[PDB]
Design a protein around this ligand. Structure first.
Ligand SMILES: CNS(=O)(=O)c1ccc(N2CCOCC2)c(Nc2ncnc3[nH]cc(Cl)c23)c1
Length: 256
């Protein structure tokens, strides 16, 4: 079992917000990240979300998945993962405006793909992949985190058009679209639709197919093959999008 007895986890600095909780930097056999729900008595729904999230996490053991270490229920519902010594991909690209070498950008994309490939093989749909949930350990290793929304089979900039419309909606392919947006961020250094200042309009338009990321903004040394893979991942029609083994193969094919 993976339950941690009450009183063992030290909780330090509040790091930010996750899906259905608050994330802190903590101590439990070294540095850890802890997500907890703060409601005194959790509702059956909340208690469910927690049981589901743990269930998904414990199915994951892979270098590119943020390492699940354990959970606590008293005094509150808490999830414990390894602490990643570094910043989220989002922070790097958009807050700090870190300029990475192209080969390092590709390597990041490769690992993210590597992680996604694993989840999908295990029948996990992340449902919340975005650069906020991708953390760079010691500047080298990529870790995908925050499984609050994952299952086994508010961040609109990564949502596939079908997900926005809600008419069907989550799948391996919607995960792949989110990946495409992460690729975009890597290759452009920007969030999409950054010349549009209205969230509802972006929602309406991506949903209806009127708007899509502008690939002419990719850094000029971004390989043609990579620009092309990005376009494939971003196909409005979900069935036209590649699978992760495919995405992986073509990234690896850039051993050039
Ligand atoms: C409890 N683990 S979790 O549920 O997988 C989780 C959920 C959300 C977040 N963040 C909080 C900040 O906002 C972005 C999302 C994190 N963050 C981190 N986790 C580990 N090492 C880390 N180094 C730097 C960060 Cl950042 C970080 C972890």
């Amino acid at each position: 079992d993976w339950e941690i007895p009450d009183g063992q986890i030290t909780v330090g600095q509040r790091i930010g917000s996750g899906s259905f909780g608050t994330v802190y930097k903590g101590k439990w056999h070294g540095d850890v990240a802890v997500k907890m729900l703060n409601v005194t008595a959790p509702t059956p729904q909340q208690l469910q979300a927690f049981k589901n999230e743990v269930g998904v996490l414990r199915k994951t053991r892979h270098v590119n998945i943020l390492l699940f270490m354990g959970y606590s229920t008293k005094p509150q519902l808490a999830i414990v993962t390894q602490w990643c010594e570094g910043s989220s991909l989002y922070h790097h690209l958009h807050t700090n405006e870190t300029k990475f070498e192209m080969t390092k950008l590709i390597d990041i994309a490769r690992q993210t793909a590597q992680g996604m490939d694993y989840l999908h093989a295990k029948s996990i749909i992340h449902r919340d992949l975005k650069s906020n949930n991708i953390f760079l350990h010691e500047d080298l290793t990529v870790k995908i985190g925050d499984f609050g929304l994952a299952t086994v089979k508010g961040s609109i900039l990564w949502m596939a058009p079908e997900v926005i419309r809600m008419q069907d909606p989550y799948s391996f392919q919607s995960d792949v679209y989110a990946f495409g947006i992460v690729l975009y961020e890597l290759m452009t250094g920007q969030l999409p639709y950054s010349n549009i200042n209205n969230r509802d309009q972006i929602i309406f338009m991506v949903g209806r197919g009127y708007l899509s990321p502008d690939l002419s903004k990719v850094r000029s040394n971004c390989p043609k093959a990579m620009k092309r893979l990005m376009a494939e991942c971003l196909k409005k029609k979900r069935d036209e999008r590649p699978t992760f083994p495919q995405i992986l193969a073509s990234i690896e094919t850039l051993a050039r």
